[PDB]
């Protein structure tokens, strides 16, 4: 399992 | 500094004053969770969400950029964004005339989906799955890049949520994205499939039926070392 924020 | 006046200026009929407030607000929203908390304590979220139903596409674009940055906060901050009613205006925007607005709305949804499973469930109830799956083939590689990210985060939810994602038809476009022209898209699609591969045997059966196994195996002969490794890890997570 892997959750990640979409950052810039 | 003067956050309540800028929040008030979010309701200003003068678009110059409004955009000035939106720019200041957006700079705070991208300054980390302590800065996002200051936006929350100033009651910025409800006026912000209300701008998604605005005549100016540029104001919508600016407000979604700020929402996407607030959605990158902690789970409690994401919850405040949902309570402000952000989900429905964001989901409606996945069918907007502007590609740049779609990109940001998918970015905001991807950040909301990086929250807990209750927040993933809220996205599912707002009907985000069908328009997100629809976007897995919508022309722009940059839009697909956003959509896969959102789906990968949703795929890390509980089995009922993964099943809802499979019911929305996510598997066939995801498997096709394992052979996409973009290397970044492939990595993202592998991540999404590896998350689906994680869980119960009913979801694994569905992946096998979609043709994820030869598509993952073909990636074991990909030039990129990290892609080969992730594809192998996805096949390991399946076995």
Q: Give the residue from chain B lying closest to A7, CA to CA.
A: B72
Task: Give the integer Cα–Cα distance in Å for B150 and B221.
Answer: 27
Q: Look at B149 and A6 and tell me if their CB atoms are within 8 Å.
A: yes
* Phi/psi at B217 (5° precision): -65, -40
Task: Give the integer Cα–Cα distance in Å for B120 and B137.
Answer: 22
Question: Could you tell me the two tokens for B34?
Answer: 């302590």
Task: Give the integer Cα–Cα distance in Å for B3 and A3.
Answer: 32
H-state helical runs in B30-74: 33-41, 45-50, 57-70
- For A1, the closest of B110, B114, B195 (CB atoms) is B195
Question: Could you tell me the two tokens for B114?
Answer: 């990086």
Report the b/e string of B40-52 with b at 16+ CB within 10 A.
bebebbebbbebb
Query: How many angstroms away from the CA of A5 is the closest CA of chain B?
Result: 5
Check CB contact of B191 with chain A, cutoff 8 Å.
yes
Method: X-ray
Task: Give the integer Cα–Cα distance in Å for B207 and B217.
Answer: 13
The number of angstroms, rounded, from the C-alpha of B154 to the middle of its chain's C-alpha atoms is: 9
CB-CB neighbours of B6 under 10 Å: 21
Domain borders along chain B are 1-239
In CATH, the architecture of B1-239 is Alpha Horseshoe (1.25)
Task: Give whole-number Cα distances, B54 to B44, B57, B68, in Å.
Answer: 16, 7, 17
Q: Look at B110 and A6 and tell me if their CB atoms are within 8 Å.
A: yes
3-state SS track over B150-200: HHHHHHCCCHHHHHHHHHCCCHHHHHHHHHCCCHHHHHHHHHHHHHHHCCC
Contacts of B150 in chain A (CB under 8 A): 6
Question: Could you tell me the two tokens for B67?
Answer: 């929402």
Check CB contact of B65 with chain A, cutoff 8 Å.
no
Task: Give the integer Cα–Cα distance in Å for B35 and B54.
Answer: 25
């Amino acid at each position: 399992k892997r959750k990640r924020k979409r950052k810039r | 500094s003067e956050l309540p006046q800028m929040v008030q200026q979010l309701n200003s009929p003068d678009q110059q004053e409004l955009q000035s407030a939106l720019r200041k607000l957006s700079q705070i929203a991208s300054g980390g969770n302590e800065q996002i908390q200051k936006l929350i304590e100033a009651g910025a979220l409800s006026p912000l969400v209300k701008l998604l139903d605005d005549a100016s596409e540029e104001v919508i674009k600016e407000a979604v950029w700020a929402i996407a940055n607030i959605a990158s906060g902690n789970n409690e901050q994401i919850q405040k964004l949902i309570e402000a009613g952000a989900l429905s205006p964001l989901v409606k925007l996945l069918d907007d005339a502007s590609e740049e607005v779609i990109k940001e709305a998918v970015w905001a949804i991807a950040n909301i989906a990086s929250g807990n499973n209750e927040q993933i469930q809220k996205l599912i109830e707002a009907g985000a799955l069908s328009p997100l799956v629809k976007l897995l083939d919508d022309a722009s590689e940059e839009v697909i890049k956003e959509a896969v990210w959102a789906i990968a985060n949703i795929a890390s939810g509980n089995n009922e949520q993964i099943q809802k994602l499979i019911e929305a038809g996510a598997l066939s476009p995801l498997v096709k994205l394992l052979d996409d022209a973009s290397e970044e898209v492939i990595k993202e699609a592998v991540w999404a499939i590896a998350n689906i591969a994680s869980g119960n045997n009913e979801m694994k059966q569905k992946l096998e039926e979609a043709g994820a196994l030869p598509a993952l195996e073909k990636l074991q002969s990909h030039a990129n070392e990290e892609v080969q490794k992730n594809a192998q890890a996805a096949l390991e997570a399946f076995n």
